[PDB]
Design a binder for these strands. Structure first.
Lengths: 103, 93, 80, 96, 103, 93, 80, 96
DNA sequence: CAGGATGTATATATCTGACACGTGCCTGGAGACTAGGGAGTAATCCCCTTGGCGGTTAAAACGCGGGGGACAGCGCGTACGTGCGTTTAAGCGGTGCTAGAGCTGTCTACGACCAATTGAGCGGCCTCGGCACCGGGATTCTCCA
DNA sequence: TGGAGAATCCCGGTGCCGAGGCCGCTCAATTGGTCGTAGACAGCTCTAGCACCGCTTAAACGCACGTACGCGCTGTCCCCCGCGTTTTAACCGCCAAGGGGATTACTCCCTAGTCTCCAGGCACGTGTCAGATATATACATCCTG
């Protein structure tokens, strides 16, 4: 027995996403397996993008481990992820910026 | 009781992207919360789309439309491409 | 408990403004900030206590605070 | 004496506090304030420690964002010193 | 056959609200009739408040019919309804307000 | 098809509050949209409340808490009182 | 349909500012307002066209515009 | 000649346009602009008239709110004339 | 420029708790089969979209006088940054305990599901009064004096 | 104030079309009954939230000094405002054409539901090493000269 994630080439669990979608469907709605594959693939892609940016930020700081500070730097350093992720990251701090006229 | 999370899959993705870089527990929890938020947004948009069109079944079309509505610009384009590729591979296997 | 808003000392407000890039600070800014923080905490704590009361509990958990923050468009990561 | 010009230590503090991630408000006074505020909504409430910590992070992030907007408003009016009118304008435009 | 709305003393339809809640409940959830009565009462109360303020505004303007302008005046003239109703009223205009320093 | 709206009930409420005052069609449409919006918000909050505590049933308590969360201040107080009054009247019959 | 952004004339922008309480208007305000309006319309129209395309339609309905406005926190009452 | 002082007619228009509820932008140019903008997302799109009307109401309300915030910013900087910097500050505070 | 003091940046050993890994198990994912409801497609029509032409006034565009507002420069005095002595309360560590969160078992009040019925609600039509439009009289507000 | 003049409120008359009412019909609320189920309550466990005490010491505080900045005042000029004349295209009205959206019917195929099996993902436990800490140490920066 092979998993659906292996069948679709995804690290994220297709079965768990399908079960969560079925749980979250309103008024006895139906959910296709293709929807679960799509959602798992998109979640995996977003994870890969955010982790790539965070790893680049961590490497720039000569540190071998990703911390919330690196996540904050990666998220606020990219326009698309900044627009997508408007939440507050605990322990992320702020991006160091001082206005030109303030110096 | 057992609390289900995404930590194992996030670790696999990290090892694919950055083989020699680890992740802290706080950062892993933040990533799990972010993925949960994205999944909740996609599910809400898909349910709204199903309600608008009187279509009780949620398919890859609904997920694609929700990704286009929620994700911004080039991020949405690349996410749609990845999802299409994954669905094509799943159907061909 | 009374007059605990003064426990947010002027050095703390100055540090918060410094993290925000503020170079010079006026004298009334401390009282204004205390009032604004009191309003924000009132809103968040009201929502959190509503969530706690719904669950028939006497102890406010981090989940209630997280849900209250999410309701007001102030989503917080790092506590579940 | 090494009397620094005013604003130099201010710039140094701005640089130092922006690179750190520690909490700026003392924990115990904030906890007392949270308990006092919650006393008005329901008496004899107990607070989980993680709840107070999350409230502290949320409050500090909100205040930092508000002060960033306040600094924007102050720079707009050709000033470097933030004033209560700047905070009021920022909260008005934000819809608060 | 006495309707549930008459039983609860409400003008709004309890049955219709119950049906809407049932077809809006997620994951084959259950809805009690008491919830429908409570929701219908809430909707009726909000309708009564908004209509009372709008009728007062219309009477102030010496007209016998409520228009979107009167709805806008009533909604923005009350702080609580202003907070509750942040949507845009088509054809409602704006409340006449001129800043002090412009005169 | 038959489009279900709250126009008749809004008119009944108006004639209960202002018997001599009429209302235009556009105002009726705006008010119907407003009531639909409020109902959507209440339903969403009730669903979130039910999900959070693992309760599959949305009873009057969920609606009451959702109203305390959504409506502000004295408006919420009066709405809760009116809902409790209506619930008591329904139960007593 | 090209460069119809100049169709939003200076008198129209002046009237819109007057409704908002503006007493005097600078020269570059018209260009700034045209750019801002173009951005806002781009966002709303993109969302509405996505809604229309999902429904396999070729006509942009007013109800899709209502949904697009609702998504961005700009609910519109009267058309839905 | 009945030459008015600069500002009186401006106040009269401010009073007149605030009490009215009509649309301020001409319908046909706005419709053409909407069609031009939608041409970039999908070619050969047909627009329902009510869709263009709703877009016009939304755009006018948004611009009126933006100009209210811009006027607040202008008063903050001790000016009566709004400037592009005021619009930029207002949009920055709103998060746009 | 240029020296003196300096806070910050750089280097290194400690360790220490935090991350990666190993194991039981149990619960959820996978495979198979059935029923059936929803999605896909096709035909129809009708009305709702786009396009076009005449006119023509009301609005946009362009000139031009000009006065008021934006902005730069200067003085000034007042409030805030900086540093020091000091103490005041926060933080750490430990302890003592009880309220209350969390899991488990019953079971009865309560809600989902189906069938029949009928009355409330929705679509279509008609009318007349409230509101909108056109014109005039009286009232109010403004510039120039 | 005063007067001359424009803007606006009010007042009226007439129209006109939209709101309120009436009627056919429809389909969903109501009532009755059954059957499962879940949430209200009681009970036990054991976890952590609260309270207290002692000590340390780092930060808050009050004060004194100094100086940079906010703000008022003045002058310059340039650039929007108000008004007049030309033009131009928006809007109303009407008419043609067609296309695509909404509806209905058929089909078929794809998913929920149920059962069985097993493996992988989550609590619990353990080792060791990357970064925070402490100390030493270099260096680019600020200030006063």
């Amino acid at each position: 027995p092979i998993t659906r994630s292996s069948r679709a080439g995804l690290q994220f669990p297709v079965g768990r996403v399908h079960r969560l979608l079925k749980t979250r469907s309103t008024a006895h709605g139906r959910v296709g397996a293709t929807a679960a594959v799509y959602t798992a693939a998109i979640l995996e892609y977003l994870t890969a993008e955010v982790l790539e940016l965070a790893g680049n930020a961590s490497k720039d700081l000569k540190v071998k481990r990703i911390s919330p500070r690196h996540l904050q730097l990666a998220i606020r350093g990219d326009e698309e992820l900044d627009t997508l992720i408007k939440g507050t990251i605990a322990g992320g701090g702020v991006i160091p910026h001082i206005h030109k006229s303030l110096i | 009781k057992n609390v289900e999370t995404y930590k194992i899959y996030i670790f696999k993705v990290l090892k694919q992207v950055h083989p020699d870089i680890g992740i802290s527990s706080k950062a892993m929890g933040i990533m799990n919360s972010f993925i949960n938020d994205i999944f909740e947004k996609l599910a809400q948009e898909s349910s709204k789309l199903a309600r608008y069109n009187k279509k009780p079944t949620i398919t890859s079309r609904e997920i694609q439309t929700a990704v286009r509505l929620v994700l911004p610009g080039e991020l949405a384009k690349h996410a749609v491409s990845e999802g299409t590729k994954a669905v094509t591979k799943f159907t061909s296997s | 408990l009374r007059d605990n808003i003064q426990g947010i000392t002027k050095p703390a407000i100055r540090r918060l403004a410094r993290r925000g890039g503020v170079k010079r600070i006026s004298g009334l800014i401390y009282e204004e900030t205390r009032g604004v923080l009191k309003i924000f905490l009132e809103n968040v704590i009201r929502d959190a206590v509503t969530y706690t009361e719904h669950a028939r509990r006497k102890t406010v958990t981090a989940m209630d605070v997280v849900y209250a923050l999410k309701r007001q468009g102030r989503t917080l990561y790092g506590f579940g | 004496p090494h009397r620094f010009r005013p604003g130099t230590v201010a710039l140094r503090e701005i640089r130092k506090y922006q690179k750190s991630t520690e909490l700026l408000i003392r924990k115990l006074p904030f906890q007392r304030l949270v308990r006092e505020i919650a006393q008005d909504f329901k008496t004899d409430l107990r607070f989980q420690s993680s709840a107070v910590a999350a409230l502290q992070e949320a409050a500090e992030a909100y205040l930092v964002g508000l002060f960033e907007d306040t600094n924007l408003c102050a720079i707009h009016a050709k000033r470097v010193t933030i004033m209560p009118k700047d905070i009021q304008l920022a909260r008005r435009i934000r819809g608060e």
